Amino acid sequence: TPVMQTIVVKNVPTTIGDTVYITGNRAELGSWDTKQYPIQLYYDSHSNDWRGNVVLPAERNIEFKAFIKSKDGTVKSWQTIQQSWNPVPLKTTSHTSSW
Structure with missing residues (x-):
């Protein structure tokens, strides 16, 4: 049963050219792969953190x-x-x- 979830990460130190991602043990998470299937997170200026669905x-x-x-x-x-x-x-x- 697939369900959409929001992952939120606080205090990430990013700099020009940087993008924050997440990966994990599950296929849906990319299986620790940083090349092809990492999940992108986005900077939310209102909450002031990085989040993604x-x-x-x-x-x-x-x-x-x-x-x-x-x-x-x-x-x-x-x-x-x-x-x-x-x-x-x-x-x-x-x-x-x-972070």
Whole structure:
């Protein structure tokens, strides 16, 4: 059962050319791949954080981490602590964490 969820990450230090993404253990998360299927996050000036929607499998546990990738394809850094959602809720809601 796919369900859309909003992932929110606070305090990411971005610079010109940087884009924030997330990846994790699930195929829907890209399976830790930073090249082809990472999920893009967007800077929301109102809430002042980075967020993005992603369709995830409800009732399944997941592990993920956000990372910064520059325009040239370089991954600059990865979120400090590995995040998790055990399990992904049955309703569309959100998961919040700090860089």
